[model samples]
Target: ENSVAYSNNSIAIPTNFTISVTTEILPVSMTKTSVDCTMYICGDSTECSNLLLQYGSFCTQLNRALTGIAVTLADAGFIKQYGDCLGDIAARDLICAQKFNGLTVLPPLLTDEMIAQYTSALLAGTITSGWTFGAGAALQIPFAMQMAYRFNGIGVTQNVLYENQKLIANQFNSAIGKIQDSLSSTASALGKLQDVVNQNAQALNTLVKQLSSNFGAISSVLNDILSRLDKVEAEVQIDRLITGRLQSLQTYVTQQLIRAAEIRASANLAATKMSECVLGQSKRVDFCGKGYHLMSFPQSAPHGVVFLHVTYVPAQEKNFTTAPAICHDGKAHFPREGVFVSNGTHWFVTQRNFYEPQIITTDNTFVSGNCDVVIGIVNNTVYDPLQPELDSFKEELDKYFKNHTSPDVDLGDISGINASVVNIQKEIDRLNEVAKNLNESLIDLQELGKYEQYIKWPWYIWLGFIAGLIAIVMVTIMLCC
Candidate 1:
């Protein structure tokens, strides 16, 4: 017979909480790392003045020899001959025609080696189509000004026509003068450009030397920076003391939570004992979790009509074990072969030693599933906090807490024990929340305990403990952050 009940006194749920708890933390470790950084970056920084010019002026003066009362050879009726203006006019006019018609009337072009001669003639700023001022006149009638591109630097004697008109025997006194003005101006432009180049070149030369000379020094610094970057991992990992500030905090809180759960369970035990000893047409209890079934059937002790005699049997699994009967409530005769636990509904059966399989159909008539609970009931004594065991338990309960479960986590042995560190604080927060909520539920359980002293618990416990935290359990995850 598996009929068990609470031993002595019963419990009164309206009492105040007599227990207190404090939580704290302990220690643990994670590895430090040194990395060889693979990449990094170089750069430079330089400085200069502007260029200035001195002067620019152009002179314009034509020769007076050819200016006064000038007359053309045609107007003067000069015929072809040496110094006659006819040939100069023909040559100049032909040059103009060739500009549009691609004619061969132009003089042969100067070659590479002829550059000096052409430049010499052209810069003089004037040209003549013929050898002299006039045919047979010992004077040259110059080609048109446009032909030689000569509007400046002209020096020419007039073309005399008739020997009778000229002074007797070539007597001449007046002079012609047209010195170049822009030739020097052009030279000034070139000079101005050269001075700017010289200043820029001088500054650049010094700048280049100064910069190039220190390249070795700059290179050395860059090498140092790069080398340092390569070893940064070592820098961060070198001889720093490690500690377990946060980890200790975590376990300390955990023990505290456990303490609370034990307290709660014991408090409600009074209500759980007699509630043992199954009764009914059936009852189910899942152990270790689901996929389990324990059904009981007795040779039905008909108290009123049918006289069913029986011998009690203990609960037993297969060759697994030949177990002893669960004798309860002074009800003996629980043979391992067969047994019964009653409450007037049916003789709830355990295992019968018969050759048949002991397990019955696995059913959830009790709402069996995966979590909180699909629940429990078995042969065990009940609980009553108001009973005699209390005074005895209180003393031991006091001593039980004095026992420490972890080594002290010393922060003094650590470096950077205060500032930026590893980050396990979030996990600690998670544990703390669980602890807090669990404690709150203990209250809920306590309230429910008030009404139904031996109420039906539909869910199973995961857990908590009594805690005394000096600071707080703001951590866990092995140890410290």
Candidate 2:
């Protein structure tokens, strides 16, 4: 009975233990099978190999070495050698990376010193053969071949590569020229802007001075009015006649207010007119044997001439009209039948074309005919005929005449007018400040525009295109090889 019991217990334990262990083993097997079935299969043996070890080591070492090296004049020779090697490798990697990853390569590091050297060499026409390695014979040929392969794409030959380089160099030269031109243009623009600001400032300052003078005049007028009020008070009893006198004073004050308003309006109009004409367009006239001839009249006796007769009407009564006098050839002449007869002892015949009534002496006679050879007038004049300085003077005079106003109506009550003048002056000053600020901003904007056109865009395009082209070529070759 005891033996049977022990055997049965052992059998029961084995069955139960095996069942539990099998349940755990079955799930683990399923998991392993699922994982194995889901795994992606690659065909390349190279992919299966240790890729990190193959490429990562060299890259890591190169990066480490790069960190150790410094780019400076003291290390220029070494840096140059390193740059050349890296440039070649960079070309190859650029092509390779693009083949594998369709993206453009970044530019290689080019120090300022290196650029300076390159520029100097280009200017001096002293560029030699491609870079050489330190190692002798065996490495040199391989290195040269590698650099050449990296330099040119499969379709492009060495000559084409050289042409591309020359094109880039030419672009750089053009960029330099444009920069210089832009700088000069910017400077000229700034000068013009400054001139405008200065003119506005001067105009405002003059207005301020005029306003101050008007204020002083107004104060004097006010003091006179006060004195008149005192005299009236002394002559009359204030108890009975104060109201009438006060009413009269009130009427006078009302009149003064109206007059002040009118004067203020006139000042404002004048300021507006000045603003309009200040920045009008200017044109250059070349008077090299062109429109009107110039003649000089000396300020001496008999030099003054009178207009004997004129078909054209004079703008002003004071100005010369028909029968007005003119001086020519130290004498005067009278017009008759389109011919000027000399009034002096010595008589000479001058054509109408050569005769200017204002400057010509009346003594000189004008015989009517085609007057090409009448008189030889020299180009000499007191004022320049080419520049036409008189035009500016005329414009100023016209402005003054058009904007002229009468003197203050109520001299005893000019205080309001004075205050209005002061306010107008303030407005002028404010306008000047605005103009100055605008001019400075305009100058800066113009300079920036020029820089963008001449310097920034050109440099970016040149470096970008050349570097990008090299990168593309390198990538193509790498992929092909």
Candidate 3:
């Protein structure tokens, strides 16, 4: 019955009971995971919508790898071992040595920072071109592929290493140049310092020489003054001796004058006494004796008593005037009552008249009073001129005693030398002060020398090395990416 039903007639099927089986595969799902994996590996836009981000990440990784390789190579001493790439390393090492030794290059690398900046500037423009691979990709996948290949083989690895070496070489060269400059600058500065030191020393020498000469001259002057002081001392001593002698002489002369004055006074008194004795009041008398007693009346008659008649002529006027004249006559020619005739001549004789006239009266006696004799004696005793002359001599001697006898020492201009000892002391003090000042100046100069030596050498080396390393790293990173 089921076989017979297979004819041209068809039974109607219910809508709910119709059953169908369909099989198909979608293209998007199939390609999705593959594209994401590709994007992760090759950094393409089909797998990652943020193309720049993906590329940036890949670039970061690449740069990291390149940096690691460069660092390893540099640390291993490979650059130095390979003579072809040793320029930068050798130069850097040399610069570090020079800096450590306190040497500099011509342009002067006084500071580490300055050297690093220079090295960085030297390596700034280096770049690498990447390879192109994909066609018409939004981010140029073909170009990225080419760039990746180039970076790995040449730009990132070999090129980067080369550039790093070049940068290191440049840095080293810069450091070397700086070192040379610094050395030159340091040399020049040191030279200048030396010149200044020499100049100072020379000036000090000249000053010391001049000061010494001045001291010598001053010493000479002081010695001269000392000599003058000695002379003054000697002169003062001599003056003292002379003054003593003069005083003694004056005393002696004064005593002589006093004695002479006493002698003159005694002589004057004696002369006055002699004059009084010679002219004193006294008179002398004269007497006659031995005459016959009886007288005869007649001469030619009988001779009772022989009596001779005698006569006296009157004395000359010259003798009478000098002294009254004395005469002798016969004894008894006295007329008592009548005239007695002698020689037949009428003679009236009286007792008073008969006696021979008394020749020398008391008033005119010669023994007590000769005026001429007294005058001659007085002239001899009183009027001598020698007494006055002797008195004048005494007066002069007294004045000499008063004026020339004193004890004063005359030291003249150097009197102060005797009063206070000063010249030698002053010179010693001056020399001491000068010596002190010179010592102080020498100490200051020595301190400055010490300061100059501390700052020049060790600080420069470490700075140069650090600068070279930084420059190489910077250049490598910038150029490889």
Candidate 4:
């Protein structure tokens, strides 16, 4: 704005002008302070005792309150004088019940860092299968022991118990991270675009006046995206409010973790434009005259859950299979290199790695897999989400079982409370409407990201902006002359 001038023979603009950039503040690390556990046992003692009868000796489980209650307490403090009534506390359904003879709820040894790292690894897909001894088991089983313990808890030989709990924690954490990352990134991206709009207000006004069509399309797309994100933000806030229905602890965790699966997807390519193309039957995709093949998400994808990738295959210009190999002394043929575009992200596949296995489901179709798997995992718990902790929880015992062994815990008892108690799947369905909105937003992000790969504006599009400014300046110069 300061340097534009028209002279007798020329027009001038400042060469030293700076395109001011605002500070880029990324979204806050998507962290949750939830003390939620793998699952919960009923708060009711009769229900708790019934649930406990399944995990161990029925006779011993009827009174878990005694196992944890400090054996020595002033008779006044004790009921008979207690300390912590038992183990398995918060985020736990009630593996351990009771409190200060007076009832002081004891907290879990689980720290936020512990959950954070576990959740981070879960989402990044760096973790797999079950508990490995050393560092892995140290964190996992001890944590499972804490899951925040099932009636059929783990021990040195407790493989089934450990394996199931590991799976649930891993799955739940991964889902949680996915939901938070999406929502956080969505807001951060929107803020950057808004800052740009606010700062270059005059330039944008001029460009729109002259480049009406491009500006209009950009505005429409951005508006649509923003409107959806606004709703997502609102839903996210409502979900966070402390809903005081202290029903089941698992119910509370559902409020935190299920929403993770419900996060809205958003994009980084709001201002870019790309054309559309259609594909039928052949698993082939074509756009702007280029061909791409359908691909699956790599085993190394950062996120859990199955997903597919549409990729641009590299090959010989004509045949499209690939450049043929020349048998140079019968050597191992190097993989032909080809560029691939997956989910708006790009990659090059090596012929050597063509046979490598990727973790995405052989049937990774997202119209349902991504959404369903998320829902299924939540629902899957009642079926034993705890053994899995089945990512799933319960409590009570007569109190003697704390001193008893796993054999006393019956599979049926374990299954009973779980079957009747968990409502995560049913609860998550509560957000189905919210989920639909998020699904649409996320799909839009994917589309935008993909569309971005195809965006190569026509020369005239830029020409319109430069031409409008240059044409106006030149016209003024001629009038002065």
The Cα local distance difference test for each model comes to: 0.34, 0.40, 0.39, 0.38
- Stretches of candidate 1 above 4 Å error? 1-70, 75-178, 213-217, 238-481
Q: Flag the better candidate by TM-score, 1 or 4.
A: 1
**TM-score against native, each model:** 0.18, 0.20, 0.27, 0.13
Looking at model 2, report the run of 10 residues with the lowest lDDT sum. Answer: 21-30
lDDT per residue for candidate 1 within 1-481, as digits (tens), equals: 2223211222111112222221111111112222111110001111000000111110001112112212222322211222242244333332332221221222233344334434444533334424444333211222332334221111111333454336533443222112245567768998999999899889989989998879978999999999998776543432121113224433544454555455445434422321321232212222111212232222222121111111123233233222223223433223333433332333233433333223322230121122221236686878857855446676768876676589877656556557445788998899799978886654243343445466644443212222323224644533577
Assess candidate 3 and give its lDDT: 0.39
lDDT of 2 by residue, 317-385 (tens): 221113222243534333432333232433333333233323344344333332122335687758646
Local accuracy of candidate 4 as per-residue lDDT tens digits, 1-481: 1111111111121112222211111121224443311123423434333433444442233223222221211222221121243322333323343243333322333457546654544443434334443344333443333342322221211443466668868988999999899999989998998998787887868877888888788899999999999977865554343222224443544454544433312112111101121122223333222334333322222232222334444332221122122122433222223211122232222222132222232232112212111122344444535442232122444333456456654445454444244457876787786867775654343343434466777888888988899999999999999
Clashes per candidate (backbone, < 3 Å): 54, 21, 21, 45
Candidate that scores best on TM-score: 3
Q: Lowest summed-lDDT stretch of 10 residues in model 3?
A: 25-34
Root-mean-square deviation per candidate: 61.3, 77.1, 77.0, 77.8
TM-score: the better of candidates 3 and 4: 3
Error of 4 at 27 (Å): 15
Candidate 1 lowest-lDDT run of ten: 45-54
